């Protein structure tokens, strides 16, 4: 079933246009997704939620408290999830940062109706 | 000290008569506790908390926030503990859902003590 | 660089005088720091937080809710960091119990400026 | 004519992506469909009713009261039908519980504006 | 746990002392429970319900509308369950007919208390 | 992503149909594009900015005060960037003159609300 987002014009295709870091020639591979899937099993975070935007949304919210203190792999994973989230939401980034930006702002939009 | 628990009418005797799932044929076994002991150690949690209702009430509180995100193994563990809790409280549960019902009833009760 | 580890009146010179138990004849060692660094890495935490008081403060903040149900290793990990915190802050402690006393006294400072 | 529904975007394609329970890797199978047909014949329910959401709806109305005391295979049959029902309405669940919540919403709400 | 079936005054001690008919010399035998166990599996009814008076109470309600046009095997099952209910409730019924009288008296307690 | 510019109905299709000059005998060749891209790496301009109209717009405004004293390769490149902008915006010119007009208009459209 995972192969349905793996299409050209889909999420994996877009993923490989998204840089790990904004000025690089290199984009995230499929293997970071696999790796991330496994790591989330290691954190007891269920991988199917990865095809579900709100489940990811909450995961990012659950994770934010741990990013300040967590490992570089956790930050790489957070950024991987953050990009996958914007990718599943069909919002367009050339790189990692823009997603972070979109998130915090989505969270600011959440803050505005958090009152 | 394990030999204190193997008496007829004890916690293990009740344990082996409790259904894993509401409609489940099979019953809880000791290996679920052993597996759970190992898991809590993997989570840097005291496995000895599985022997008391104060301990179990606290573990269930610790694990509950991770259930939405969790794996079957974790849910099966949580459920195993809800049953252990009910057994330590001498509540004669016959399955997992009923044990779980009891836990959330106890939460409604603690709410009554904290209005 | 190496001269720093044979420094007189330095942090390691103080560390080896601190007792494991209040009256005891056994003192803190370098291998406890090595173990704690490896464990934090195992727990998906940035080990770079051990070098300063503020990184350690974040770790102790992180560990405090987990103490209630924590393993003996997790409590040992907390206790080790608390003694190091005291060394970093230049608090003169002779044993583990005194380090815990000093830590609880430092935590009452934010209470003092609550009005 | 069952094959008309095993095409991509159809019943089987979605069926194989729906979890048997909210938490696990085991997803629904075609052999379960061939079974569901046999089980409805066991209850004198015409399997051709599974091709219409209204057939299924009235059946679920028929069928739900027997689940409190009946088999785990019967609960599976109800849930299997609830998913086939959802396939026709194209309610997008990832799992069975979400279907059950959607079913008891479908068997409720209209209740308030039907009374 | 075997010692429960040969307990003086236990449920099976009572079972074997309850007459199959009021004028008759025949008493309920364990094999009626066994025979009933195949029948409950055949009717897709959970066998664990006959270990408890509430599960039995609910089954007797479920069977109640269906008895007027039923089979001898089914009536023999209903009557077997009515005796098991009475035994589980610790009602010292001496025959099948008394177990039925007790079921209809118990059904009237909540009628007496209807308003 | 240079290969995205290779779409039929896309940028290369249009480039090969766009005269290099208002009445130019030669039309765009992919080698000028490689070279152009490279040249922008020479000028500290990220090539990913040439895969978007926003990138090209920002580049032209920056470059613009320096256009009067720049090189013929840079002016050919400037008019190419102007065209890259126009093809990304799906604006149809057959030569570069119209693009100039559109750009001054974009500069004038941009300045029209600047009050
Ligand atoms: C459904 O596609 C079942 C097969 C799952 C394994 C596919 C392996 C290759 C693609 C992995 C994509 C992971 C991210 C969506
Ligand atoms: C505390 O009891 C120490 C550890 C005991 C190990 C398990 C013993 C379980 C009971 C055995 C009873 C054998 C009777 C023949
Ligand atoms: C660091 O303090 C500067 C010197 C780094 C080069 C190696 C020094 C070797 C001598 C160290 C002291 C004696 C051995 C522990
Ligand atoms: C339909 O045209 C009637 C003739 C029989 C068609 C069989 C198609 C089998 C498809 C896979 C199994 C479906 C099980 C419900
Ligand atoms: C449950 O109560 C535990 C029962 C343990 C065994 C009791 C002794 C059984 C003796 C059987 C003797 C042979 C009978 C044919
Ligand atoms: C995006 O396509 C970058 C990765 C592929 C590069 C090789 C194919 C390039 C085809 C067009 C020629 C280059 C023009 C700048």
Author numbering:
A (entry chain X), B (entry chain W), C (entry chain V), D (entry chain a), E (entry chain Y), F (entry chain U): 1 to 115
From the reporting publication:
During virus assembly, a primary role of the MA domain is to bring Gag to the inner leaflet (IL) of the plasma membrane via its covalently attached N-terminal myristate group and highly basic region (HBR). The MA HBR promotes Gag membrane binding by engaging in electrostatic interactions with the IL of the plasma membrane. The HIV-1 MA protein forms trimers that assemble into a hexameric lattice with central cavities at points of sixfold symmetry on PS- and PI(4,5)P2-enriched membranes. During HIV-1 maturation, the MA lattice undergoes structural rearrangement, with mature virions displaying a more regular hexameric lattice and smaller central hexameric apertures compared to their immature counterparts.
The mature WT VLPs display a regular, striated MA lattice just below the IL of the lipid bilayer (brown arrowhead) and clear lattice arrays in tomographic slices sectioning along the membrane, as previously reported. While mature WT VLPs showed the same MA localization as immature WT VLPs (IL/MA position), the mature L20K/E73K/A82T mutant VLPs displayed two separate density valleys. The density observed in the trimer center of both immature and mature WT MA lattices indicates the possible presence of a negatively charged entity that could interfere with phospholipid interaction. Specifically, the mature WT MA lattice is typically stabilized by a network of inter-trimer salt bridge interactions involving residues from the HBR and glutamates from helices 4 and 2, namely, K17-E51, R19-E51, R21-E72, and K25-E41. These salt bridges contribute significantly to the structural integrity and stability of the lattice. To assess the effects of these mutations on the mature MA lattice, we performed MD perturbation simulations on the mature MA lattices containing the R19A, R19L, E41A, and E51A mutations (simulations 10 to 13). We observe that the trimer-trimer distance distributions for all these mutants extend beyond the expected range for WT MA, differing from the WT trimer-trimer distance distribution with Jensen-Shannon distances of 0.33, 0.32, 0.18, and 0.24 for the R19A, R19L, E41A, and E51A mutations, respectively. Recent structural analysis suggests that proteolytic cleavage of SP2 from the Gag precursor by PR is required to form a mature MA lattice. The SP2 peptide was shown to bind to the inter-trimer interface, previously predicted to be a PI(4,5)P2 binding pocket, and contributes to stabilizing the mature MA lattice.
